[PDB]
């Protein structure tokens, strides 16, 4: 109730402020959906921790460790081994070094099917592409062969850092450097 009155005050002062609010209860989201100036196309959002916690554990009923798989992607952490770690802890902790990142696919991806783009992006660029923004626009997750990549497609990647996903923007194919070391993609200008 206190945090809803804040969003009311902020929106009353100026309607076009992007407001992101943390909600403790899902039913309280209805009250701010009824605010005249609230608009999710304008980027307003309610991070509802009840809706989220129960969704993460519910997906764990469908895929047992998935709450851990998925909660690690959304916090910045970093790999820093010690020889005191068991071998399994070094595998696990490498996985915790992943986050999910957004970047534009380079024009070299244009007119690939999403599966071909994902094969390329994994095998050559060492990046796990898993979804794309399809043009209004909408999110498509692992879309089938029927969906082509198009110019200025935003992709969603799992990667070890933001500096990794840049490589998908920089990649030229045969028009410039495209071979061997993943450090060698650089910037090309064709």
């Amino acid at each position: 109730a206190a945090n809803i009155m804040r969003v009311i005050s902020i929106k009353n002062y100026h309607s076009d402020i992007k407001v992101i609010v943390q909600l403790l209860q899902y039913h309280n989201k209805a009250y701010l959906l009824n605010i005249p100036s609230w608009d999710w196309k304008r980027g307003d959002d309610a991070v509802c921790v009840a809706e989220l916690k129960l969704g993460f554990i519910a997906q764990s009923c469908l895929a047992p460790g998935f709450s851990t798989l998925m909660a690690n992607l959304f916090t910045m952490r970093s790999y820093k081994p010690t020889p005191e770690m068991s071998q399994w802890q070094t595998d696990y902790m490498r996985g915790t070094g992943m986050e999910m990142y957004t970047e534009y696919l380079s024009s070299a991806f244009n007119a690939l099917t999403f599966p071909e783009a994902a094969e390329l992006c994994f095998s050559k660029l060492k990046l796990l592409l898993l979804a794309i923004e399809v043009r209004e626009s909408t999110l498509a997750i692992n879309p089938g062969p029927k969906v082509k990549i198009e110019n200025a497609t935003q992709g969603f990647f799992i990667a070890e850092s933001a500096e990794e996903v840049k490589r998908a923007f920089y990649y030229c194919k045969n028009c410039h450097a495209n071979v061997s070391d993943v450090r060698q993609i650089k910037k090309c200008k064709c």
């Binding site: 009155m5 009311i8 009824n34």
Partner: protein, 330 residues
């Protein structure tokens, strides 16, 4: 048709609350229109606000029964059972139990077809946070103002009682009032969309300086609660009534506050670029209609807001969209 024993109000014999309780369905069934909706926020244990003082003025004998506005209260049922002992004598009254924030209640009630929606709260008027006190009333205003309807929203007539006068700043958009402005200058008060108990304080001083002025305001706002009725209620037997003699029923003709439009009918000739002084003299003489102010659109060029001009100058110009506050015997 029956009346209170003093002739002043329409009356009917007692009933159990279950005769006037409805359900979302029954309600929607009901053809409600031009009604009054009361959005009541209460806990079962909260203090009695006395809704008889809201429903009684709307059931005066100087109205014909056909022009009595139907009334529906949306609110907590356990609270309404405690209130009902005072309401049970008024006709054309009904209850839809549940939250006023529940959108399906508002739609069943035909909130889009009412003549006024009243937002009122029995909750703790000095609970901990001075910004939380009116959150239910503010959310209810903003909720109704954001709805949409099909064969809207911010067009529906609202009045909200506020516990903290400052919260008026949240109550509407396209205000652009400086938050340092005192309540009486704010847009929601200037339009009659907001009310707060603070504006009543100078009734103590005016009660002292001229007691008769306090009896005028009352005769008007109560719809005619005489001290005989106040004594008859103080006998504790409830509001006694029935059929009436012509000798008491003579009082059915009393002055009422009414509103008339310059858009059509005999006064429209003044709405067409006349002046308030021409209108006043004409209406007084031909109809005994005594004009006391105007209710004019703020957006003369596009919202439905209007504002109130108490006692305009004699040479004050008129618009065909103006409405006139008048005192009348018809």
């Amino acid at each position: 048709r029956k009346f209170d024993s003093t002739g002043m109000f329409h009356w009917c014999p007692d009933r159990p609350l279950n005769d006037c309780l409805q359900d979302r369905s029954q309600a929607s069934a009901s053809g409600l229109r031009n009604h009054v909706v009361v959005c009541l926020f209460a806990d079962a244990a909260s203090p009695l606000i006395g809704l008889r003082n809201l429903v009684m003025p709307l059931r005066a004998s100087n109205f014909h029964y056909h022009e009595l506005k139907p009334t529906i209260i949306v609110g907590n049922l356990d609270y309404l059972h405690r209130e009902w002992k005072t309401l049970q004598n008024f006709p054309k009254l009904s209850i839809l139990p549940g939250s006023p924030l529940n959108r399906a209640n508002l739609r069943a009630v035909n909130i889009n077809l009412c003549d006024m929606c009243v937002i009122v709260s029995a909750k703790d008027r000095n609970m901990e946070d001075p910004n939380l006190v009116d959150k239910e009333a503010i959310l209810c205003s903003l909720n109704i103002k954001a709805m949409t309807f099909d064969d809207a929203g911010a067009n529906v007539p609202l009045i909200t009682e506020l516990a903290n006068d400052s919260n008026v700043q949240f109550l509407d958009q396209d205000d652009d009032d400086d938050p340092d402005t005192e309540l009486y200058m704010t847009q929601p008060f200037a339009c009659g969309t907001a009310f707060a108990v603070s504006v009543l304080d100078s009734l103590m001083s005016t009660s002292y300086f001229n007691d008769n002025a306090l009896t005028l305001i009352r005769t008007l706002i109560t719809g005619g609660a005489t001290p005989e009725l106040e004594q008859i209620l103080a006998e504790g037997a409830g509001m006694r009534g029935g059929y009436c003699s012509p000798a008491v029923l003579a009082n059915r003709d009393r002055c009422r506050v009414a509103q008339i439009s310059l858009f059509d009918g005999p006064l429209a000739q003044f709405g067409q670029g006349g002046h308030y002084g021409e209108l006043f003299v004409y209406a007084l003489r031909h109809f005994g209609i005594l004009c006391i102010g105007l209710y004019r659109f703020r957006d003369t060029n596009p919202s439905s807001k209007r504002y109130v001009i108490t006692n305009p100058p004699e040479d004050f110009p008129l618009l065909p969209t103006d409405q006139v506050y008048v005192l009348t015997y018809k």
